[PDB]
Design a protein around this ligand. Sequence first.
Ligand code: HEM
Ligand SMILES: *[C@@H]1O[C@H](CO)[C@@H](O[C@@H]2O[C@H](CO)[C@@H](O)[C@H](O)[C@H]2NC(C)=O)[C@H](O)[C@H]1NC(C)=O
Ligand SMILES: *[C@@H]1O[C@H](CO)[C@@H](O)[C@H](O)[C@H]1NC(C)=O
Ligand SMILES: *[C@@H]1O[C@H](CO)[C@@H](O)[C@H](O)[C@H]1NC(C)=O
Ligand SMILES: *[C@@H]1O[C@H](CO)[C@@H](O)[C@H](O)[C@H]1NC(C)=O
Ligand SMILES: [Ca+2]
Ligand SMILES: [Zn+2]
Length: 595
Amino acid sequence: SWEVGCGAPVPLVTCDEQSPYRTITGDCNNRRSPALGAANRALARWLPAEYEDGLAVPFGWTQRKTRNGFRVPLAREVSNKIVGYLDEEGVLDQNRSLLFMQWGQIVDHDLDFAPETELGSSEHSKVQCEEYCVQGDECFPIMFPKNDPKLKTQGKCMPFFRAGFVCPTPPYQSLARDQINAVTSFLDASLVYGSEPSLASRLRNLSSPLGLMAVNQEAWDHGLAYPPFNNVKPSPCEFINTTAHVPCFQAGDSRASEQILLATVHTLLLREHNRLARELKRLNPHWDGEMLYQEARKILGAFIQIITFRDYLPIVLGSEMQKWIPPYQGYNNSVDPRISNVFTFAFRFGHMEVPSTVSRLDENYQPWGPEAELPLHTLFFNTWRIIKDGGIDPLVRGLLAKNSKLMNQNKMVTSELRNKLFQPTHKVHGFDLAAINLQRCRDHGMPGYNSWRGFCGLSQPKTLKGLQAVLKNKVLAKKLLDLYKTPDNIDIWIGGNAEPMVERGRVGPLLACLLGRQFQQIRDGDRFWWENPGVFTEKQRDSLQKVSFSRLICDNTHITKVPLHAFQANNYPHDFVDCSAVDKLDLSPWASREN
Ligand code: HEM
Ligand SMILES: *[C@@H]1O[C@H](CO)[C@@H](O[C@@H]2O[C@H](CO)[C@@H](O)[C@H](O)[C@H]2NC(C)=O)[C@H](O)[C@H]1NC(C)=O
Ligand SMILES: *[C@@H]1O[C@H](CO)[C@@H](O)[C@H](O)[C@H]1NC(C)=O
Ligand SMILES: *[C@@H]1O[C@H](CO)[C@@H](O)[C@H](O)[C@H]1NC(C)=O
Ligand SMILES: *[C@@H]1O[C@H](CO)[C@@H](O)[C@H](O)[C@H]1NC(C)=O
Ligand SMILES: [Ca+2]
Ligand SMILES: [Zn+2]
């Protein structure tokens, strides 16, 4: 097709080839092609990219250039008309805890990140795009439709910058533009440890030979650790509160502080690593720091894998689970473990699971203080509410006792995200995640809804009436066809999420196929999959079998009352048990005999 190995990634990689541990970058996982699944490479293309010029320009870039004979509608107009809603009453998922939404964001951050291009440290373009809304090069602003309230209060557009792409960072015109995945495709806790050697080391505590991750020295959570602050400026977490001056955290993944409950979950996983490394020291006093770090890292990675595949994916995929992710059959080196470009949009189904508020709960799981419940938007890049307002525990209780938002054809994305999103370097709580998602679909050259329907062996509606039948919704289908004149033009993010949910699941048939295929691949094609014979010992695997998010909480907070099944909707005190009833991770099988 085109250069089979296009230039400008890191070349200085040598594979140990016998190391019992994953690299940080993901390289060396697949022995026959060591770059597969490695960070900072092109996202995989399950289907050829679709750009208006066939190479790099997104559909919607040139006003006259149609898609299949029709103009593509403004991202912000699709957002207003279809995505938005007013009434938060009744939107909550009766049988999914708030943790269910949160774990999805965690897994997503482990698997993919396509960062915005750089090309201007001294950049004024950064200001030309934001101030003047003039589209050029990497600046691809989201223009407001006429009648948009933001036009009255926010100017002519929301700034938006095109995703980074492989080889040159300046645009290339021989083959199709490929966006970068900056994190490791393997489900491997890279959101905790980093995907770059440079970060992985800064995150570590190399002052003591105990294999610990560095912790905050400024602040403590009633004797429990926080992540270290990221001390680089300008910091958006300091920006959102001038007076508090609390910086964002520094985790293995840069997005850790985007919202308080993500920072919260990252805090729990950091604690788990240090806890694991302490127990591993007790059992093996002869183990050096590097061994301790690696062995703890490897345990945490298995923890993430098991929670994800045993607890999370079955309640996302429902009846489709078995169809796409059959019981494990061992490592298959013929499988491409790379995250596909389309998956990074498919996994965005989580955006419709996010509720409008976040609660802090006390020991009786009752409102913690007068302002117990807060609007989600005041919690973007908010670390001060953690450090200066009771720590992680009240937030973890809310994660357990409150519900995710239920996806709803008439109520897709809360205005907390739709109208009030805060983006770093940008000053207002006035962005639209839904518009961004749609603009990004186009930025990434996504094939349309029907191309993916075909990919998944599903019917391809061509008329209003066909789309009504597929979506089981007359009003939604009319709105979609009014804006997109053919279902062929419907951006995949909105198309996939518009479909009614499969039995015992939380996504439609199209998404279950795109997600199902991807997760099957990341598992089957991972040489370090926790259940691949030889990765762990059989005795170790028996111990790992009993990990639970309930136990993670017990072990790493001062919560003593937890539900057995943390992802379902649980109410206190009935669905909650004392931690003493909860299975523990038995680290005995990690005892390594020297004599
Ligand atoms: C704030 C945001 C969230 C919570 C309050 C949130 C939540 C999720 C969940 C629950 C997801 C999956 C179950 C999920 C997936 C992906 N997101 Fe999202 N998300 C918040 C905010 C953002 C923002 C901002 C972005 C970047 C948008 C852009 O295109 O510029 C974002 C992205 C993604 C994403 C793509 C990641 C990538 O590969 O680059 C998901 C797979 N989220 N989020
Ligand atoms: C910024 O953070 C500060 C510091 O926590 C918040 O100020 C606190 O707010 C209430 C008063 O309404 C008090 O209970 C705290 O003691 C205050 N501290 C101080 C130093 O004033 C403030 O509410 C935050 N501001 C914003 C805009 O989020
Ligand atoms: C490094 O580990 C030592 C020993 O456990 C501890 O005293 C110190 O606080 C740690 N430093 C960081 C930055 O985590
Ligand atoms: C391994 O994966 C390849 C390609 O994805 C597939 O054709 C083959 O069936 C797989 N092997 C097994 C044993 O499933
Ligand atoms: C709640 O969800 C779980 C799976 O998470 C399922 O087993 C159970 O039947 C559900 N309850 C109801 C009432 O649907
Ligand atoms: Ca990863
Ligand atoms: Zn305490």
